[PDB]
């Protein structure tokens, strides 16, 4: 096939390339530490009113979306602009967590394009909102038999709220023509009304805690990236290695090289990687690429015989009538201690001939 002929003259012909196929994939990504504080936001003992909704910025951590999935009470986990399945891989620059408490009937209002008291006067999302909304029942934490009068909402406002805007003003709403002068009464109402939560209310009126996660990308490098799985480490085999975003394929043998504490990789004279430090355990490994060889076929003429021998150039015999030569591993020829003239050259003083195929 290589010579494009049906008759092969006597000699050695380089026909293919032997390779050691990768067996496993080892993705030793950076050690998972300093997870994003979702326990502080979701599991807080005290939430905020919807008029003074709490906003927490999230940056420089690993965003873990598995804790959220684990929690069973969630009534809505509706996501907008990104899929829930690909939350852990696609990553963003800043994450805003907005926390508040509303009544169940208004949970549908926390979405782009919706109208109501909460959307117009308390919390507005833009029409191009990229993020998720999470809501869950909070009867055991926010309902009191006497009535919980610590949750408030804005019922009256002159104009609608802009997206991601808060209003903590306590000015009396002037609905008529006469000035209010700071005193309530007729045509002058206090805008903030209390959410008097009680445990015996209907499902549309029980307290629901809502956390809105808004993801934004800016010109800055994105640093809230979800943790990448770090599989176990396998040594002494040809494994596809992914160490801290540096990819390749090679054996990882033990190393005698003493790295300085600030160094992570290692390079050859010719600027090719020869070493690496594992980011889970501070140890040094000698990256050595998997064995490759020039498969050469040693044959006499097809007029004489169809027997062949295979020389793997540069490959030790343990990594592939098997004889080890300095040229490589020769399979299919029998070493003879007799010396003859060279018929088919193998290399390093070794020659092959047909008498079976012998190497000498």
């Amino acid at each position: 096939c290589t010579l494009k002929s049906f008759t092969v003259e006597k000699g050695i012909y380089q026909t293919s390339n032997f390779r050691v196929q990768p067996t496993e994939s080892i993705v030793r990504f950076p050690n998972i530490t300093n997870l994003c504080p979702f326990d502080e936001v979701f599991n807080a003992t005290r939430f905020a009113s919807v008029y003074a909704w709490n906003r927490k910025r999230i940056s420089n951590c690993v965003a873990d979306y598995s804790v959220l999935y684990n929690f069973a009470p969630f009534f809505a986990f509706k996501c907008y602009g990104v899929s829930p399945t690909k939350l852990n891989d696609l990553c963003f620059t800043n994450v805003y967590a907005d926390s508040f408490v509303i009544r169940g009937n208004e949970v549908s209002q926390i979405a782009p394009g919706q109208t109501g008291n909460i959307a117009d006067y308390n919390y507005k999302l833009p029409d191009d909102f990229t993020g998720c909304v999470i809501a869950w029942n909070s009867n055991k934490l926010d309902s009191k038999v006497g009535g919980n009068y610590n949750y408030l909402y804005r019922l009256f406002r002159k104009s609608n709220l802009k997206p991601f805007e808060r209003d903590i003003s306590t000015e009396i709403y002037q609905a008529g023509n006469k000035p209010c002068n700071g005193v309530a009464g007729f045509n002058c109402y206090f805008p903030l009304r209390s959410y008097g939560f009680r445990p015996t209310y209907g499902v549309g009126h029980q307290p629901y805690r809502v956390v809105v996660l808004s993801f934004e990308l800016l010109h800055a490098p994105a640093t809230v990236c979800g943790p990448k799985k770090s599989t176990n480490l396998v040594k002494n085999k040809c494994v596809n290695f992914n160490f801290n975003g540096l990819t390749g394929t090679g054996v990882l043998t033990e190393s005698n090289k003493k790295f300085l504490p600030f160094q992570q990789f290692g390079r050859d004279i010719a600027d090719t990687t020869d070493a690496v430090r594992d980011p889970q355990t501070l140890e040094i490994l000698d990256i050595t690429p998997c064995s490759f060889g020039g498969v050469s076929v040693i044959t006499p003429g097809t007029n004489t015989s169809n027997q062949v021998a295979v020389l793997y150039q540069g490959v030790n015999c343990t990594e592939v009538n098997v004889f080890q030569t300095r040229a490589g591993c020769l399979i299919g020829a029998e070493y003879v201690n007799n010396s003859y003239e060279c018929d088919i050259p193998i290399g390093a003083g070794i020659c092959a001939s047909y008498q079976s195929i012998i190497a000498y």
């Binding site: 009680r198 015996t200 209310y201 209907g202 499902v203 549309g204 009126h205």
Partner: protein
Amino acid sequence: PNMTQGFWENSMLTDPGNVQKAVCHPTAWDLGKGDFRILMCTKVTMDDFLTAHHEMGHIQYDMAYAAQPFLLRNGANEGFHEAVGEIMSLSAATPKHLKSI
């Protein structure tokens, strides 16, 4: 639609005892804020079964107009509220319904 969970939790469908005294009149209560209860000292009779259907018809009528404003949460006139319970009392008393259940 079926009954709420708070209806099953908060209604007292059995006479509590001698120590605690309660009014034995069958009454359907719309407490507001999605809270619906039935005050009924049930006895094991057909009459209490029909009365339970009547009061649950009252509760369903109260349940349906929960989306309305508070001052409009009533029957359109005084006859409708009892009529929608009496039709359930009519339907439940038929021999076909008793053979069905």
